[PDB]
């Protein structure tokens, strides 16, 4: 159930 993610070394926080 993907939702919305938010990695540190990505930098984004939108989508999962």
Same mark, same amino acid.
């Given at each position: 159930?993907?939702?919305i993610?938010?990695? @540190? @070394?990505?930098?984004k926080c939108? @989508?999962?």
């Open positions: 159930v993907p939702i993610y938010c990695n @540190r @070394r990505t930098x939108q @989508r999962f």
